[PDB]
């Protein structure tokens, strides 16, 4: 059910709606989970959905979290990752669901949570996680793989496409308007997003950029300048600047980093 | 230095147009103007706008200065930092409107985020001053511009960042140079303003009267403008520096002669220069020398002292004639002139013939022809 709190069109559509002061909105989130779920996975029984999300409160309220990203990716990376011989590794029998799952979600931020909430023993960001089998790894050590089809997005993985789109959003949008136009993709585009449209693309994008400079000061847990009181409305993050009283704020600030838009 | 003095404090009553003016060395002046500054203010080193990349702003180059400065003093110890940069990324972003030879339409809608509306590359640059000012704890920016002797064009683009960036009120511009090199500028770009039709067909008489007779006008309303008399110094002479005849002497200089010259020896600079006159010309110390050096008195100061730090110097290589020690002297530095004039340039030529020739032309162009040969400055080409 977890993926849905994660990967819902709706749930973005209600989230970035709502003014930022709403509170006791639980309920959105049900409801629209429902919704979502319904349109991905249709199969479910009607019931399996409410009771999963229920269960899934239900633990939320046992261990003491809000509902939230925090308690998922803490429930998700318990659930599957463990801290094993090399860094954290995946269980064998969870592992043609977690990538049923990454179908759906990147890895990354469950990856951050679990060295945060379940480091190992005293690491290197790498993808993607793996199980673990000696016989398996003493094979692939002895003889390697050989790498015969990768043709998919160049021949990356999209993770980092995103920040590089990030890194270039006026190229990526570019991208996306001459295409716009071919009928191919707003099929595509609807099917994904019915509201979507390169307008509200500039958005998502260009608010995505200010939430991760807002966050990256908190993370330096930095003095939380002023024009966040200001702040009220998720739309208002999608200027390149905010005004607070007159000024116009942007939202750069200087991490510890020189490639600002790395994985790591 | 005592009119370095008396500019500074010009300066310094200043902030309670803001452009002063300097005619014309004058680099050396600005200089010792500059560091005299190091009643708040903060100054930047002085731009050479004959010294940048051929196509580039002022206001680019007075930016990065600007960043340099701005991340010295804030890395020297926040809140102003960031705020910073994001004057820099809307500046950056609204920069193309100058350089652009085309509008692509793509810019109105940035023409379309947001106290006046649109993009004042004048409002980003001024709010940028007084973000600088703030952040360093000044008054005002002092901004330095260097003389376009050896590129006269470049200045327009200094004239237009004034006009149109630095009508501000914690901005102190100080440029250097003559005013009619600036002159021929707004001469030629007021010519360009016309249509070129126009030009080639409503050619005659009445027409171009009235036509430069606009152009003059305009010439005299802008440069006004641009540069408050009052905020012009005049740069005194170095002849104006000493006495005239030896009733004046308002800082005398002294100059040293040989290579010891232990601070006593100096001989003078208006003793000297007759000394050398005399004896290279065989003049004895009477009033026609004098007068020569007195127009020796209004050349340029490089061009003096070059001619008496030539001199001199060979003649001590020599003592380890004086006149043709001193005519050597005086071939290069009139060398241009002398070439320009038509004049013998073969050194290997002088004798008495290529130069009763060349005596005969010069009286020829001087006109004269009833004491030309007397050969004194009294001519109105200062060549």
């Known amino acids: ?264 | 230095k005592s009119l370095r003095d008396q500019l500074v404090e010009s300066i310094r009553n200043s902030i309670a147009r803001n452009v002063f003016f300097v005619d014309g060395g004058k680099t050396t002046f600005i200089n010792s103007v500059v560091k005299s500054l190091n009643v708040n203010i903060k100054c930047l080193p002085t731009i050479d706008p004959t010294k940048l990349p051929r196509h580039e702003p002022i206001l680019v180059t007075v930016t990065a200065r600007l960043n340099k400065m701005v991340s010295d003093k804030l890395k020297g110890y926040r809140k102003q930092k960031e705020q910073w940069q994001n004057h820099l990324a809307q500046l950056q972003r609204g920069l193309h409107l100058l350089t652009d030879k085309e509008y692509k339409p793509e810019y109105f809608s940035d023409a379309l985020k947001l106290s006046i509306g649109g993009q004042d590359l004048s409002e980003i640059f001024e709010e940028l001053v007084k973000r600088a000012c703030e952040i360093l704890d000044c008054k005002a920016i002092l901004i330095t511009f260097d003389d376009i002797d050896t590129q006269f064009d470049a200045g327009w683009d200094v004239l237009e960042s004034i006009r149109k960036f630095f009508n501000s009120r914690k901005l102190v511009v100080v440029a250097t140079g003559d005013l009619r090199l600036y002159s021929q500028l707004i001469r030629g770009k007021q010519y360009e303003n016309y249509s070129k039709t126009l030009l080639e067909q409503e050619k005659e008489s009445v027409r171009l009267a009235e036509r430069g007779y606009m152009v003059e006008h305009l010439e005299q309303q802008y440069l006004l403008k641009l540069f408050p008399v009052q905020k012009r110094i005049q740069l005194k002479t170095m002849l104006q520096l000493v006495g005239e005849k030896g009733k004046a002497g308002k800082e005398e200089i002294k100059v040293k002669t040989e290579p010891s010259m232990q601070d006593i020896d100096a001989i003078d600079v208006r003793q000297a220069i007759g000394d050398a006159v005399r004896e290279g010309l065989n003049l004895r110390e009477g009033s026609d020398a004098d007068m020569y050096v007195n127009e020796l008195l209004k050349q340029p100061v490089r061009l003096l002292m070059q001619v008496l730090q030539d001199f001199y110097t060979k003649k001590y290589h020599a003592t380890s004639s004086v006149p043709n020690l001193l005519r050597n002297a005086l071939y290069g530095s009139m060398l241009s002139n002398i070439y320009r004039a038509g004049l013998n340039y073969e050194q290997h030529r002088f004798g008495m013939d290529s130069l009763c020739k060349d005596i005969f032309t010069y009286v020829k162009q001087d006109r004269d022809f009833n004491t030309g040969f007397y050969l004194r400055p009294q001519s109105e080409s200062e060549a």
């Open chain 1, 1 to 264: 059910m977890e993926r849905f709190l994660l990967n819902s069109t709706v749930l973005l559509y209600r989230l970035s709606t709502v003014s930022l002061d709403e509170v006791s909105l639980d309920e959105r989130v049900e409801s629209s989970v429902f919704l979502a779920q319904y349109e991905q996975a249709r199969s479910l029984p009607d019931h399996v959905a409410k009771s999963a999300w229920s269960y899934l409160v239900q633990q939320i309220k046992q261990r003491n979290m809000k509902l939230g990203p925090v308690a998922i990716l803490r429930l998700i990376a318990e659930k599957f990752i463990k801290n094993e011989k090399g860094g954290p590794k995946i269980d064998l029998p969870m592992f043609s669901e977690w990538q049923t799952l990454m179908s759906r979600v990147s890895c990354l931020p469950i990856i951050a949570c679990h060295q945060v909430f379940n480091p190992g023993p005293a690491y290197s960001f790498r993808w993607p996680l793996y199980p673990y089998h000696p016989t398996v790894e003493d094979y692939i050590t002895r003889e390697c793989l050989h790498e015969t089809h990768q043709h998919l997005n160049g021949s990356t993985s999209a993770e980092e496409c995103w920040l590089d789109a990030l890194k270039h959003p006026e190229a990526c949008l570019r991208d996306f308007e001459k295409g716009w136009a071919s009928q191919e993709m707003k099929q595509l585009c609807a099917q994904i997003d019915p509201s979507l449209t390169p307008r509200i693309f500039k958005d998502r994008l260009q608010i995505a950029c200010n939430i991760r400079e807002i966050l990256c000061r908190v993370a330096q847990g930095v003095e939380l300048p002023e024009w966040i009181a200001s702040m009220q409305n998720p739309q208002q993050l999608a200027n390149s600047t905010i005004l607070h009283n007159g000024r116009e704020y942007g939202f750069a600030t200087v991490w510890p980093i020189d490639d600002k838009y790395s994985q790591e």
